[PDB]
Amino acid sequence: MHSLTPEYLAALRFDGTQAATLRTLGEYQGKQQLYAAQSPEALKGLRQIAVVESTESSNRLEGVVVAPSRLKSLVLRNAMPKNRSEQEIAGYRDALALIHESATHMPFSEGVVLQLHTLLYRYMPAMADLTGRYASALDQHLADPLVLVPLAMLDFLCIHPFPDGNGRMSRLLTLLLLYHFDYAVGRYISLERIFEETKEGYYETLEASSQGWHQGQHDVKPWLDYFWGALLRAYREFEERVGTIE
Amino acid sequence: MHSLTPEYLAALRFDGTQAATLRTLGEYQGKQQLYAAQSPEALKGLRQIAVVESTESSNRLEGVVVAPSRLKSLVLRNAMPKNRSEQEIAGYRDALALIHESATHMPFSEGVVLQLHTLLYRYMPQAMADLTGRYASALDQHLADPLVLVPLAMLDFLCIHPFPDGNGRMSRLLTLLLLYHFDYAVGRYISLERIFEETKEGYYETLEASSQGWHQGQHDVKPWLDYFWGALLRAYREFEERVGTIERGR
Ligand code: NA
Incomplete structure (x- = not known):
């Protein structure tokens, strides 16, 4: 877990640019409750688009697609999966559903990770060292959560802990950890979709920042800059839908 | 203007700490708007305390004090000053009130700076050229977050020492002015001058530390930034404690 030592x-x-990016994300988080108080009538409409786009993009990034009409049925009208692709969609759907409704009760422990991985593949016929270093970094304030969350996911992808679903699991765990710090934009704007729209940057930065990772000589700036950037696109896009302030 | 080059x-x-501090202040900035609308009563109570503490504390840091009963009659009733001490309390009172009500119509221009310095010496019987245009140039191009520009502009303001007298009080008045330009309005409900006075040792140790080698433009602003942000935090943390009390024991 070279990133969380x-x-x-x-x-x-x-640098001064990154510092400003963090302060800006702090600001957006603070206004989260205001935005809602100003446009609560808009929250339902955003959730349905996000819950569908999240399941759609997270799976399509892995080459898994379903007919556009089946996507609707599986995600919105709890339909039963009929083939391998639909089973992977219903799996992500259930995992996603649970995180949106219980993330603040689900700690980042091997138990929770295995629990989510089990849902992701429930329609199909050193995590202890990661969760521990992460837990230890928080306990001692070794870095702001907007640094730990993304580095933990970089390490998760490098660790490649499960034979299958590491990419999707990394995207599911990103929502879980952001909710632990009340970064709820993921509920009204699909982060998986935002990543898929900057797909090239997403994979280039992950590969660039995972270079020399085994030696502990890797550079996380490419991945952080990209992550914070996608998180900003989410807030700006959320703002463009629920007004601003004084 | 060695800090705004x-x-x-x-x-x-x-480092990781400073980064978390900026994120935290960003969090507080964007939430006192709704935290206000949900507790309007508590505020008006803290405001009549901060306005008195701000004037009392900013002047006492310069060894200027008045009778305890006169301090309230001057600040809360606009009483007329009857000696030099009261004339400085009254001057700050007027400049402070001007900033708390027109800060968003008062850019950091030489005009606004002199307008304020003139008020500060309204009841008394009797450079900024670049600093202002340098800061303007820094904001326009986004060379740094406003939580960095503001504190560095005040460090430069104090090192320039542009007025024969008042430089200290002026830096504290200008601190409130600039913070309002970025929606850091906690200074209105919790006195930043008082928070500085309660930690005067740190206030001066860091200003003297971060001004070493200032003329050659090779000074370390970390001691001052860390202190300033820390003070701005005590203010917000202290604002959440006070609003969480006055609204539970009605
Ligand atoms: Na909890």
Whole structure:
């Protein structure tokens, strides 16, 4: 878990641009409750588009697609999957549904990760060291959660802990950890979709930042800049739908 | 203007702590708008305390004090000053009130700075050229977050020492002015001057520390930034404690 070691984290340095990006994401989080108070009538409409786009993009990034009309039925009218592709959609759908409704009760432990992985594949016929370093980084404030969350996911993808679903699991765990710090934009704007729309950047930054990872000499700036950027696109897109402030 | 030079700003680097601090202040900034509308009563109560503390504390840091009963008659009843001490309390009172009501119509221009310095010495018997245009240039190009530009502009303001007298009080008044330009309105409900006075040792140790090698443009602004942000946090944390009390024991 080279990204979450005390040595690696204590060495991280941010330029004036990154610093401003963090302050800006702090601002968006703070206004989350205002935006809602101003346009609660808009929240339902956003959720349905997000829940569908999330299941659609997260699976399509893995080459899994279903007929457009079946996507609707599986996600919105709880339909039964009839083939391998639909079974992977219903699986992500259930995992996603649980995180949106219980993330604040689900800690980042092997138990929860295995629980979510089990849902993801429920229609199909060193996590201890990751969760521990992450837990230890929070407990000691070794870095802001907007740094730990993305580095933990970088390490998760490098660790490649399950034979299948590591990419989708990384995207599901991203929502889970963001909710632990009340970064709820993921509920009204699909992060999986935002990543799929910047698909090239998503995979280039992950590969660039996972280079030299085994030696602990990897550079996380490419992945952080991309992550914070997608998180901003989500807030700006959420803002463009529920007004602004004074 | 060694702190607001593109080279000095493009060079600044922040550790994991400083980064978390900026994120935290960003969090507080964007939430006191709804935190206000949900507790209007508590505010008006804290405001009549901060306005008195701001004037009391900003002037006492300069060794200027008045009778305890006179302080309230001057600040809350616009009483007329009857000696030099009261004339400085009254001047700050007027400049402070002007900022709390027109800050968003008062850009950081030489005009606004002199307008304020003139008020500060309204009851008394009797450079900024670049600093302002340098800050303007830094904001326009986004060379740094406003939580960096503001504190560095005040460090430069104090090092320039542009007025024969008032530079200290002026820096504290200008701090509130600039913070309002970025929606950091906690200074109205929790006195930033008082928070500085309660930690005066840190206020001066960091200003003297971060101004070493200032003329050659090779000074370390971390001591001052860390102190400033820390003070701005005590203010917001203290605002959440006070609004969480006055609204539970009605
Ligand atoms: Na909890």
